Structure formats: structure tokens, C-alpha cells
Amino acid sequence: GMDYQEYQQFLARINTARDACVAKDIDVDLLMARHDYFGRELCKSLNIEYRNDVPFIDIILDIRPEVDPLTIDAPHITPDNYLYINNVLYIIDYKVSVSNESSVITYDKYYELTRDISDRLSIPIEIVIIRIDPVSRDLHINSDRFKELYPTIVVDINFNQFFDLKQLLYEKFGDDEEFLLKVAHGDFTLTAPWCKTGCPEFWKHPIYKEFKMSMPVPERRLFEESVKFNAYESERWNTNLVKIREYTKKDYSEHISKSAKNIFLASGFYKQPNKNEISEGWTLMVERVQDQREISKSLHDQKPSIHFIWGAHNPGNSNNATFKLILLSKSLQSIKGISTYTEAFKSLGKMMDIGDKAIEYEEFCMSLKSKARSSWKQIMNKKLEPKQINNALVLWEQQFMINNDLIDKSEKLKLFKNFCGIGKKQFKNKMLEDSKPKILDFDDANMYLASLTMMEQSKKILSKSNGLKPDNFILNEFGSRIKDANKETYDNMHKIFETGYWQCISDFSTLMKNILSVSQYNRHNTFRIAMCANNNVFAIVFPSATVVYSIIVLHKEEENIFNPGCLHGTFKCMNGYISISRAIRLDKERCQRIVSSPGLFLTTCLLFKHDNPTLVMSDIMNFSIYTSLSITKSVLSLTEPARYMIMNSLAISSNVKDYIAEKFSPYTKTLFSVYMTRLIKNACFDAYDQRQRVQLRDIDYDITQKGIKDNRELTSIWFPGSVTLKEYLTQIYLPFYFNAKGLHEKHHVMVDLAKTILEIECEQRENIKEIWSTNCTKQTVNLKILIHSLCKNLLADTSRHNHLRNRIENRNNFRRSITTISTFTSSKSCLKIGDFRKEKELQSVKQKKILEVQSRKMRLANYEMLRNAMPNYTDYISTKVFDRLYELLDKKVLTDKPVIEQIMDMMIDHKKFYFTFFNEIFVGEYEAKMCMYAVERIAKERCKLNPDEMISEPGDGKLKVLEQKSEQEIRFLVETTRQKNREIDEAIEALLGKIEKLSLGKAKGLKMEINADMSKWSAQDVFYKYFWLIALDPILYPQEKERILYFMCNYMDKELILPDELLFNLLDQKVAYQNDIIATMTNQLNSNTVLIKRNWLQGNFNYTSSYVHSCAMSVYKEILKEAITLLDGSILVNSLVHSDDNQTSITIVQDKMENDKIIDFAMKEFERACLTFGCQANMKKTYVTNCIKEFVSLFNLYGEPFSIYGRFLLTSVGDCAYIGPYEDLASRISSAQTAIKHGCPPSLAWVSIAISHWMTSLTYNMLPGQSNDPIDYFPAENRKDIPIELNGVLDAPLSMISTVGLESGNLYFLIKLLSKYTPVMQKRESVVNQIAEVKNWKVEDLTDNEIFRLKILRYLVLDSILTPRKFTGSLRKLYSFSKYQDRLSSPGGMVELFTYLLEKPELLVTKGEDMKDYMESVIFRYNSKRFKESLSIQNPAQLFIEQILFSHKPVIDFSGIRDKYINILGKVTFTEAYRLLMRDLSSLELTNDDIQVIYSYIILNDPMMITIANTHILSIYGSPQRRMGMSCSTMPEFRNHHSPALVLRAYSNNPDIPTEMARDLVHLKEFVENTNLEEKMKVRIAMNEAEKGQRDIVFELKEMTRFYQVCYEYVKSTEHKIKVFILPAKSYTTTDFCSLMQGNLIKDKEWYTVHYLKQIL
RNA sequence: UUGGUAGUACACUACU
RNA sequence: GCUACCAA
């Protein structure tokens, strides 16, 4: 082959090389040698003279000696060789390449540059590129004329020696990162392998053998060939892809064409909504429902539409608590007549009859309260003895003993067993496996009329004036701003607040708050009494998670009550009537929503009514009060399907028939549900009849006006009136968001989920046999089409970023320690398998002991078993992520080597996988999490490159993309139709019988929007298809592929673990063989596991699956395009993909076919496209329009963006962790912020903000006149002037609130001061200038309020403040906690660890890359009280009520607050904290320097706060204008290093442990010494210990922590988040965004232009 | 840890 | 579950 001396030299250089530099040079020399070697052998075959390089002037001098080299101006190119024959100049170049790319550039360059000289000399110059493929050895020559001179070229040439040399060089430097960078060139770069060896076990894996045998022989070879391929060692990175693509090209192209030709087979009759479709669907629905339910036509089977009866108040009587107590007692005893429970009721009134001894009652109660309020903790070891007060046995305020002297045992029993339903079961069952749930007959005539009268009656009663002042918190504290935003909404509030509706719901809320408060400490042998501001309504809280209660209403006329279907009986008493509701057993989470309901109801009504004069508020309220309060499964079964039913009904193409027939399953237990089912039914019919008004006709300015200039011509759904399209959509989609979470029980959501999973698995085992098919067989993939489409997409996507593998590694921290990755160190749940029999069986015993004790303590009248019955029980426990990492680190299973390297190892080591449900809906092992991390993050990055894949799109990016696509599509439709008819239009407008002939022949536009949904995405996918996605991937090495595929093989052998909960119930009633799917699939409860093969579990492979989804839509695009060119038309196809969400947009212009046939064609190919890739498009849900896009609950209407922003407003009432006034309010406010960027109008945002305040204050009894109300305790004559940190009212422009939330409260206050106290001459200056002028301020001139505020800002805010502490862990399952306990018990353990952390203070804020660092930082965490509390799951209802009940107890650690400004035993009450705060401030004065420090930490430290400050000062507003055409704009960056963890270590002073580390460190030190800190805490430490006379290791830790936490939040750069705002115009800069925001959020009806007087940022 | 004895604590309170 | 006392 090559020269031998030359060969041995290369072999010496390779052996000697120690540098990427040296090795790189060898690579170049090998290539250049190989190129020369070819040329020499090539020239020998052509029998011409060999020349390595030849100047072009020499070519001329040779063929034209008479030409003047000084005047010819020859090009500056150097061809390898040439040949002048027959007056034709052949320019030659040799290439050794498997690709033609080098040749194209060489040709284009040479050809272009030889044109000038060709024309001058009259010499034809032919450019000849002679290439040889070094693999096949085939020659390729472009020049047809050169092949005529050499029609037979033979080059017996062998490149084997060059391949061996290259291979030896590359093997030696394979791990050299620098080598890969230099060698790689230049559209593809790799990194070092993640592992050395592959996985031989893969090739023997039965599941691989299954995957193999299922393919034809060629595809087997190609798969094994593709796995063993690696781009690093190959000529090009894409050879494998290209090879496999070309092999499958024939069958692919035939599929595209065969499918495209189907356009001519379309009948044009596609699935389509109409009267009959709806009717027949409904018919089939009723049939199915009857099989599955027990239908009743009887009203007495009715369930409560609302868990509440109500009556108006009585101004004739007193509203004193004690008065009301007696009033009820007497009213109960004076019940007249005989009925089943009247004797018990009278007895109850007797048991709370304190007679006239009210003063005794009060003082007894206040005595008990004072005691309880004396302690932060609960009172212990002091028995509560009931006091005798008249006939009543009083245990506590409004708690009464169940006195057996005052009630017959026979009557008492009826009350519990039958009325309360406590301890009763009627098993009228015939076989072992025979009792269906009962519902009302929604389609019965009279049953409907029954529901209608309830709605009618409730309107007659609640519409009436409540006869109260409308005044309330929302109105008094936010009415002003709401009115200025929009007077209409202000008026609408009053309309509501004046009615019985508002009072009724407000009463239910207050009473429920009190019911819950009261239920907490209620005992098994006591009842309790709840009251509210309405002196006619009460609640009896019956003895015992849940509350059992009955509402009691006092009223004058007997039928004058609001009875939403839960009245038990109305009774005549002494001075009128008394009504009692059925006993209600309601879980406390529902109860908490009831408390919140006034917010929901107000929000709902104002929303539905907003800006619509056709709607009657009365009608709105009657509907809204039920949706707000009917917190039931009944309504849930209606609001979900309503979206699909109604939308399908008005769609171009859809399937109402099937959706209603199969999936609509009403649970009409209440009358309201029956009433609502009807509204939905009519909605569908009404929807179809106005279908043509929604869907656009044949139409640029005619299209956009429809959505922008939205006129009100559609029929309203839930109440009489007319409605715009937007408003129409809100009525359809909003109701789903009324629904509460967890309306289903614990046991019942699991069981349903378990059964579906198991059923699907069982179906597959017995029917699903095939993996591949060409006819879209159920749950199959078209093999060759998958392969070809993957190659094509893998090529296109990989080409648009050359450093992809690097991107993956860096963005997902593959190279870094596992201990530095959030998701691998989280507090999420995780699963581990092992032997925990003893632990659990001991707990089984200990649990039953505590059960019987409490069960024995009654003045009233099993794991071990499981594991004896189950031979194959896979034992397990659920721990936390960080805890499992600790354990594995501790047992040296894991290490702190790069995470990706351990993942690779884990893919071989973990052979058996397990998953289960929660205590991402599946919990997996930590090991499972590691493996899938690699696969999904690889996919993640390539999804980001793929332009159609959107699950990878960061932030709010989707809403902006939808808009860009739809504005691109309106353009295409318009311009394309205008250009196709330019000539027809000209002939027409030039000139009625001959105009008509021409107007038919013109092209018609077709726009269709496919809003699609995929079916059983994860449960019925063809998981095998992803094997190719891995094998074909060029960025993966063979060793990496082998391990990944071995994992995926194992993954298809994974097992689901059935929670013991499911297994008990079945064993409990297992007398013999049973057919329940759970027992069936467990070999009759032999195992607690089931093998789950084909179902990859929901949430685990989203990116991977979403990438293939994109591939399926790329085939779809090609089919539609080919189909339309057969009609010589134009087409634009766009597709947006998001796991099981798909929005595909088609725009067509053609003149040979009716649109109905194109629609019919397009949908069938959509269905087929999904199926060929193993996806099942769901046509019950999938619907088609020509104007409305829907994608992941985002809309685009005729080009304009649209969102159901209401859903965020409804969640702004319940979302908080219940920690404190400031935190809770912050949490609730962020929902209003979200709604704003989603298009919420100004006035409705304020209502949300108002409600948020109310709920927050309500939680801590801080409302006006309430105990913890701080107004009187501070220098302020208005809530707006009291700080936000002390639960003051928020005061700031809405534009500012939107951008920076609660922190705007202070920021605005500081801005008011600048506007007031800077000199008259400086007022028009920027912020920085006005802050400098603070040194010329007079503190003495400031008002008391202003100094109070400033003092708080200075000494408290710098580095939330009034946060209650709780006495509370139950952390037995945490491995790391047990170790923390070993260290507590160890003699010097903890001090040793505290010491270690002070030495490495980096660990106080971060977690080091080191293992030891991590393990020791975790043990440390446990020393924190608040951390340990986080690990235990907490019921939000219990968090809510605990906060209420402890409101008067001392829960403020003021000593923790006070110490921070110095240079008392235990806890304190809220109210006492206020007082202590004021006192301290009085003796702590405020200087001009202090005020500057305030401005510098708040304003000047944040570029955002500077900008926002300037925007408010320097702005001036232009005249108002309408809102027309809203646009999506991304929020720009305002703010302008290395890993914070290491940077902080360097600080404690060696940038070593590059130079840039010092660069970081230098300006970290500047931040320190300017606002001195290093010297501040050193002094602060020295003081504390000198006072104590001994070292205080705790205080030193606290100080250090905050010192370094300040540094941690200074160093770390925040990655700019993508958040998109709907605005009146487009924002192109930071200046635009502020002006628009500032100008868009002031008035509902109009918006303003905002200009500025000076520079801003 | 086991066994025994005795307990297990609090809001609304309102123009109505 | 938590608390106080007692016994091992």
C-alpha cells in the first residue's frame, strides 16, 4: 500500500506522542499522506504526470507560452493537476472522502474563479473532481466530458494501512478531551466516553432476543451494526445514519406516495357533529349508565346539592354569643310535635341549657382560655372537669357533655346510628361476587323539574336584599382601586354584597371556620356549638380527618329558608320555627374550601359578568353559588366532559357521538347536578346550531377582525344571554377549574389506577402479540418507516448543533458529582427494596397497642397476617431522595465520581426494577431514577433543537410560538390565495354569465386547525421503537449504547408493587378464588407485584416519547405535501408537539377539489401517521376548527392570544403553606401575577389581591376589629401606611405589584418619600441622583408614620418577621436520621460536626462536590427545627386550623427578632409583639446615614428596582386608546464567575484548591468591605461571647450562615427565566416592556402610551 | 425499649 | 401520637 519507511515513521510518532497537539499533527499528516498516495496511484492509471500542487499561472504559461504573466491577472488557486487536450483545459483535484461536500466547495470555487480567464483566452475550462471513497474504493467524477476521455479508470488501491494507523492514534488519545476538540471538524464534536467497557449481557437478554427475532434479517444486521458503530473512529459521524436511511428509502418513499394518493380516494364525508350525533350519543350514554348505576326517580334519595341550610338574620334579637347560646338551647327544647328525632334534639338543648347563669358561664370560659393562652405548648397533666351550670355540663366555651341523665339511651342510639350515621351496612348480597352506586335519574322529566324548582326557589330567596351594610374587608380596603380600574366592576361588587347570596355564603364560610375550630378538641362524649355573625344560624358539631355536623336555622315563617336539598325537617317551636339539616360527614379539606368560597364565588360572578350587559347578575349568582359550594364528585363528573362535549359539537370535524356514548358518565347525586346535566345537554345542541358563527366562512383584515373586534352573537351556556367567542370559551373551560383536588378518597383513587394499569397489562398479555406492522395494527410500529424517519430527524437535529454531546453534559451536570444535582438530592419520595419484616412487624404490634388503648378509653357504647398469606412478597419502604443517596454513599454503592459514569455502572448493576404509587404518578427506586436521567436528558437536549417539539420549550415559550405560527399562517393563506388568483382577478375587474365562469376556476383557501389528544400515551406505546432511537444516535459510544439498551431491556421486565392497602381489603374478604383483576394478576394474592412490560410508566419517558411524536408529524407533513402537489396546489403545515398533546395546523390553496374531501383525507392520514409510529390519536377528544388553536390549555383566536386566566384567580384563594401573614400573602399574590401576564384586566386583578389579603388575615385573626389587628398598635391612620411585614395592606401601582410582588410595598413607599423630600430643583432627576440628595434631609421633619416605616426597614427588613413557631417529627424511615441520632448520643459528636462546618462554612449554604461534605451537611440539617418539620407530610386543612387556634397563644420568638438590633422568657403573642416592637424602636433612632443604607440595599443593589423606580418617576402618559390586537412579549432581563459552592470555599483565600477564580474572588471581597461584613460579625461574635464569658458555637453558626448566605445569593447568577405577557403592543426592549406594563394595567376599558423624560437603565 | 398509672387545652365572639 | 409519675 503506502511507503514503508513512511509507515514506520508514523508508527514511531504515534508511540512517542504525548500531546493532543502532536497527535493532531499526525492526523493531518496521515490525511495528507493518504491524499498524496491516492493521487500518485491515480496518475499512474491515467498515465499522466503526477503533480502535488500546481500554481494556475504555470498552467497558463504551459498551454499559452505567448501569454503575458504580468497582464493576465490569473486566479490564485492551486489545483492538484491538469490536462490540456483538444483545446480544453481540464482542472483536476483529488479527494479521499466518503462525502461529496468537499468536492462541491472545491468545484464552486474553481469554476467561479476560472470564468473571467476562460472568456478572455477563449479556452473552455472544465473543473474535474476525482474522488475516491476510502471505504468502498469506488471512484466518483462529476465531469461528464472527462469520463469520455477516461471511460475506464482502474485504481487497485488499498487504504488498510492508513486505517490501522488512524485507529491506533485514536485509541491512544480517545480519552484526551483536547484531542477530540482538535481532530473533530467541524459540525460534529464528541467528548470522552462515559465508560470503558460495554455490556455483553445485553446481547443475551431474552427481551433483546425477542426484539431481534421480531425483525427481518436485514434489520437485525443493521441494528447490531448500528450499536457497534461509533462516530469517533469513523470517517464521518453520519455514515451509519446515511447508510440505514438509504437502505429504507424505497419502502419509505412508497409509503409517502401510497398515502398521498389516498387524497383521490376521499369520499369527503368525515366524522362531523350534528343534532343526531348528539342524540344518539346521549342515548348510548344512558344505556351504559344504567348498567353501571342504580337509577332512582325518587326525591328522597337526593343528596345535598350544598351542605348547608340558611336563613336571614333577626335584627330584633341580640348578637351576643351567650344570648345566642341560650336562644338555641330553648329553641331546641321548645320543639313541638312528635317525630323520630325530636326527643333527642330536645335532649341536646337541655344539655346546653345554662339558664340565667350567663355571667358564670363567661367567667368560667375566660378562665380556661387564659390558662391555655398562658403556654406556647398545650396544657399538660391537668384534667378538664366539666362544670355544672344549670342543666349544662360545660367542659369548655361551647362544649357540652353528653349527659345521660338528660336523654334516654334508646333515643341517644337513634341519634348516632341513624341520624349521624355513626356505626351502622346492609349487605343484602346473594353470591360471593354479585350493589351499584346510586344516582338520580337526570333524564327523568319530574326529577329535572324538581331540580328546576330548587334553583327557582333559591333565586326568590337569595336575590332579595340582605338588609345589611354592604361594607366588608374587600369593599372597604380595595374598593377605591377597583373603582378607578373600572367603575362597572365596583358597581357589580355592590350588587352582590347587597343580596342574600353574599350574606348566605359569607355566613357559611364564617360558621365553617368555626365548625372546624370547634371540632379540633371535641371529644367522643361531648358535642359543640358553632355560631356566626348571623344570629339565626348555628351548627351542632357531633362527637367523633372528618367533621360531623348539622346546621340549625331559626326563622319566623316556616318555608322562608334556603334549602339546597339538605333539609332534614322544619319544626314549630315557641317563638317561630326551627329547621335542622341532615347530619353532614365532610372531610376537613372540603370544609376548608367552603371557608374560602366567598372568594371563589365573588371571583366567579364578576368574571362571568365582566363587561357583558346582556347577562343578569341574579342568574349568574344563582349558578355561581352552587359551583362554589357544591363541592362534590357530582359536579366533577360534569365540568370535565363539558369541555369536550360542547367543543366537539361546534367543531368542523370531531366525534360527539362516541365521546358522550363512551366517556361521559354523570354522577348526578344532587338536584343541582341534574339541573347542570341539562345545561350541558342544551349547550351541545345550542353549540351546533351556532357552529357556522364560530367557524369562519370564506373570509387579512376580514380574518383578524373576527377575533380582535369580537361581537356578541353566541348563546350563553349556564344562564340566559348572549356572549362573545372569548366569553363563550371561558364559560366552557373555566368550570373545570372550580373543582377541588382530592374529592375522591385515598383508597379509591389508588384502586381505580391500579385496576386500569393491570387491566391494560392483562389485555396485552392475551391479545397484543405483534410489535411491527404495515397496516397500522393496534399497538404496533411500522418498522422501516420508523427507522428511516429517525435517521432523517437524527441527522437534521444533530446537524444544527455541533457540540451537542457537550451541551448535554454541561446543562445536565453529567461530569459533576451526583451530590451537586438538585433532583438527586431532593426531598421527594423514593423507593427501596429489602428485608424490613422485623421493623414493620414491630410497628404492626406497637400500632395495634396504641389503637386498643385509645379504643378502650371510651365512655360510650394486620401486617403480620399479610406476609403469612403471601409467599412471594417483595418487601419495601418509601424514603426520601437525599436519604437514599446518603445510605448508598454510606455503603459505598455510590460515590462522588462524575454522575454519568455511575449511571453507566448502575445500568449494568441494577437488573430488577420496581415501582409503586404515592403515599410523575409513580414512585421508583433511586437506581431507576439514575438510569432514566441519562436517557431523558439526552432526549431533552435534542428536543430543544427539534423545532416542533415543545415539551422542551422553556417557560411560557409556547404561547408566543403559537402566535408566531398563526400569524405566519394567516399571511400564507392570504398572499398565496392572492397570487394564485392574480390573473383571474385581473380578467374579472377588467370587465354576469362570463364573470361567473372565471370566478369558479379560481383557487380556494382551506385552513384547518387540529387540536389533538393522544390516547393511553404511555400505557400502550411500543417501547421497542426507542431501541432504535438509542442505537442510531451518533453522539453515543457502543459501550454507552450497550448499557443503555440493557437497561431498557430490564425496564420491560419491571414490576409494579401493589400497596398493602389494596391487598388487605381483598384478603379480608377472600373466602375462595376471586376474579378481581388485582387478585387475578397476583396469582390469587400470592404476590404483591405484577410484571408491567409494554406500559412504560406515565412521566418517565416524556422527552423520548415526545421526540418520536415529532418524527411522526414530519412524515405527516411529507404526505400532505406530496398529496397537494398532485393537485398543483400550495400548502403550509405546522406541527406543535408536547407528549400526548398535539396541535397541527394546515393551510392549503388549490383549485381542483372540494375542501370537504381534503379534510376527510387530511384526518385519516393524521390518524394513520400516529399509528404507524405506535401512537393512538384520540378522536373522541381530538377536534378540528379553522380559527381556534388549542395547545396545552393555551389558545390562539384568529391570530390573537387567549388564556383562561380565571383558573389562576380561583387558585389565588387556597394556595399557601400556612406559615405566616407575609409568606401566605406572597404565595396567594403570585397567582394574581400569573393571571396578569395571561391577560387579566386591571380591576379583576385587584379583586384577586383583595381576596388574597382577606383569606390571609382571616387565617391569623388579623381582620379589622379582630384581636391581632395591628392598626391601633402602630403610628398609622390607614392600613396602607402600616408595613406589609406586619400584615399591613399592600399599597402600590398594579404594574409594580405584577413585576416584583410584595416587595413593591416598600419600594413604592420609598418612592413616595423621594417625591416628597428631595429638593424642588432635583425632582426631575433620575433615581440615583435623588438618592444622593438624601444627605440633605431633615429627619425631624418626617412624620411619625414615615420614621416608623423607615426604622422597620433599617433594623428588621435588611436580611418576613412575624412568623409563628409550632411545637410539632416521626422520621423513623430515614437512614440518615438514625445516623444523626447516633451522633447526638456520641460524647463529642455534635460539637465535632459544628466545628467541621465552621471550618468549611461553604457547607452551611451549599453542598460540596465531595461525598463527606454532602454526608456531613445532611446530618447538620437535622439540627434545624424547621427542616425536620418539612420531611413529614402535613394536611393543609390541619395547617390552616392549627394557625387559627394558636392565634392567641404566644407563638412569636421575639428574642430571635430583638437581638438583631442591640449594641424575656420564651415566646410572645402577636399583640404583645407589636407592643414590644414599638417600644424598642422608640429607643432606637434614625439618622440620615440609616436612610441611605435603606435605599442602597433595596434600590441601588438591584438594577431591576432602579429601572422600575425610574419608570415611575420619569414617566409621563399619552392619551388613552382602545385595546385592539394583543401580542405576546417575553419579559426582558434587567440584571447584568463559577460554581458558588467552590467560589465560597475559595473565600476561606486560595483560588487554587485558574486565575479567573481569583477574578471572582477579588470583587467578592469588594462587596464585603464596602458594606463592611467581615469586620462586622467578627465584632458581633466577640461581643456575644464576652457577655457570656464562654464560646457560643450556636451563635457563631447562625452568624456565619447568614454571612455566607448573603454571599451565596450574591455570587449565583439566576438563569433568565422565560415568561410571556399578553400586551397591547410588542415589546422590543426593556424600555418597551416597562412602558407597556405601566400603561396596560390602569384602566379596563383603555390603555395608555408611556414615555420617559430621561434615561432609565 | 418494655410494662403500669394518670391526663392530653381552644378560634369566632360580629351593623346581623 | 404527645405529656407527667412509677417499675423493670
Side-chain angles (χ1 to χ4, degrees), chain A residues 564-789:
Chain A
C566 87
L567 174 70
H568 167 257
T570 293
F571 304 97
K572 175 68 182 166
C573 60
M574 197 75 73
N575 194 4
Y577 296 82
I578 180 168
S579 280
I580 303 163
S581 70
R582 294 160 177 164
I584 299 299
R585 184 187 301 281
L586 206 64
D587 88 307
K588 304 206 178 204
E589 297 189 76
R590 282 183 188 181
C591 292
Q592 204 232 118
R593 188 168 192 81
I594 287 169
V595 173
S596 82
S597 57
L600 309 173
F601 174 78
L602 174 59
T603 306
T604 299
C605 294
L606 294 176
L607 209 68
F608 278 151
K609 181 61 172 91
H610 179 66
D611 199 20
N612 191 335
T614 319
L615 301 173
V616 179
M617 184 65 89
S618 173
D619 297 337
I620 292 174
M621 284 186 295
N622 208 46
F623 179 72
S624 298
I625 191 164
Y626 277 97
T627 58
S628 298
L629 295 176
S630 190
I631 300 156
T632 53
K633 295 200 290 285
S634 59
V635 169
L636 175 56
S637 60
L638 277 39
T639 45
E640 259 182 34
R643 274 159 59 159
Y644 305 112
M645 292 163 69
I646 295 170
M647 278 281 123
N648 286 342
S649 293
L650 54 62
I652 287 163
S653 182
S654 73
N655 199 321
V656 272
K657 184 200 171 65
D658 297 344
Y659 184 83
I660 296 165
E662 287 176 10
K663 305 293 170 154
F664 183 50
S665 197
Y667 203 67
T668 46
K669 294 233 183 211
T670 60
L671 275 188
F672 174 68
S673 63
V674 171
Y675 174 71
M676 188 167 185
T677 299
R678 178 56 56 84
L679 287 167
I680 285 159
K681 193 184 187 177
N682 295 332
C684 297
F685 289 116
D686 287 21
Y688 172 69
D689 276 321
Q690 65 193 357
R691 174 179 160 186
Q692 68 292 346
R693 303 200 202 193
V694 175
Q695 307 303 343
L696 194 65
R697 309 163 162 182
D698 291 13
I699 308 157
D700 194 334
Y701 210 59
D702 290 281
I703 302 170
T704 54
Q705 269 197 29
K706 300 278 171 174
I708 296 164
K709 312 191 183 189
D710 206 349
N711 65 290
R712 182 138 31 211
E713 63 178 55
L714 301 171
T715 71
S716 178
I717 298 167
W718 310 116
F719 29 82
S722 291
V723 75
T724 66
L725 176 58
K726 298 201 184 191
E727 295 164 353
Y728 192 57
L729 289 173
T730 308
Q731 285 196 41
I732 301 166
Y733 284 84
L734 185 73
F736 169 59
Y737 301 103
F738 296 155
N739 299 318
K741 293 191 172 189
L743 293 176
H744 293 273
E745 298 189 359
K746 169 56 175 164
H747 176 76
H748 289 136
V749 179
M750 260 199 184
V751 167
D752 294 334
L753 181 59
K755 284 195 172 197
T756 57
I757 295 295
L758 264 48
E759 279 165 352
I760 290 171
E761 172 64 15
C762 182
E763 193 64 50
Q764 285 161 1
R765 286 188 193 183
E766 284 153 35
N767 284 346
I768 302 303
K769 306 314 213 299
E770 297 293 329
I771 299 175
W772 325 106
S773 88
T774 57
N775 59 5
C776 294
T777 298
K778 288 260 184 282
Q779 300 186 49
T780 57
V781 174
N782 187 328
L783 177 54
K784 293 189 204 297
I785 307 303
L786 166 70
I787 295 166
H788 188 89
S789 186

Side-chain angles (χ1 to χ4, degrees), chain A residues 148 164 271 520 612 843 851 1076 1205 1311 1319 1359 1533 1593:
Chain A
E148 283 163 16
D164 296 332
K271 296 285 188 172
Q520 189 64 18
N612 191 335
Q843 270 283 49
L851 190 75
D1076 182 305
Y1205 63 81
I1311 281 170
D1359 197 330
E1533 181 88 284
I1593 206 81

Side-chain angles (χ1 to χ4, degrees), chain A residues 1017-1082:
Chain A
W1017 186 246
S1018 62
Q1020 295 182 351
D1021 199 343
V1022 186
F1023 192 70
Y1024 293 102
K1025 77 190 183 184
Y1026 303 123
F1027 284 27
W1028 280 99
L1029 182 55
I1030 295 297
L1032 295 168
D1033 205 326
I1035 75 181
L1036 300 178
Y1037 294 83
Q1039 321 97 50
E1040 302 172 350
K1041 294 186 228 171
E1042 284 188 351
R1043 294 192 191 201
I1044 291 166
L1045 294 163
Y1046 181 70
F1047 155 60
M1048 290 172 74
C1049 282
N1050 284 328
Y1051 186 88
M1052 292 197 75
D1053 279 338
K1054 66 193 176 300
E1055 293 180 13
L1056 172 77
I1057 306 179
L1058 301 179
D1060 290 331
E1061 172 171 13
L1062 276 47
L1063 307 173
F1064 283 131
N1065 276 73
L1066 283 158
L1067 260 169
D1068 184 49
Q1069 64 183 3
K1070 180 193 178 74
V1071 184
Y1073 192 92
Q1074 38 190 351
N1075 312 323
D1076 182 305
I1077 192 69
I1078 293 167
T1080 294
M1081 297 296 275
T1082 50

Side-chain angles (χ1 to χ4, degrees), chain A residues 202 208 471 662 839 1019 1036 1150 1466:
Chain A
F202 165 59
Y208 167 70
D471 306 325
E662 287 176 10
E839 293 95 313
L1036 300 178
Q1150 57 82 30

Side-chain angles (χ1 to χ4, degrees), chain A residues 820-881:
Chain A
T820 72
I821 301 163
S822 297
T823 57
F824 281 110
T825 67
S826 70
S827 299
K828 311 263 195 176
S829 279
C830 150
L831 171 57
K832 71 169 182 172
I833 274 54
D835 192 330
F836 312 105
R837 208 213 192 101
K838 199 200 183 73
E839 293 95 313
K840 287 183 172 185
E841 284 201 343
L842 268 172
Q843 270 283 49
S844 170
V845 170
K846 293 181 195 189
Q847 187 75 321
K848 189 159 190 176
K849 288 171 178 169
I850 274 69
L851 190 75
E852 289 176 313
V853 166
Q854 293 167 345
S855 180
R856 172 267 304 168
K857 294 171 183 259
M858 299 296 281
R859 281 184 171 268
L860 183 69
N862 195 85
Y863 183 68
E864 296 193 0
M865 179 193 68
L866 182 60
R867 290 205 57 173
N868 290 323
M870 292 195 163
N872 294 310
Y873 185 98
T874 313
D875 193 18
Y876 71 102
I877 54 169
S878 65
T879 185
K880 299 293 193 290
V881 173

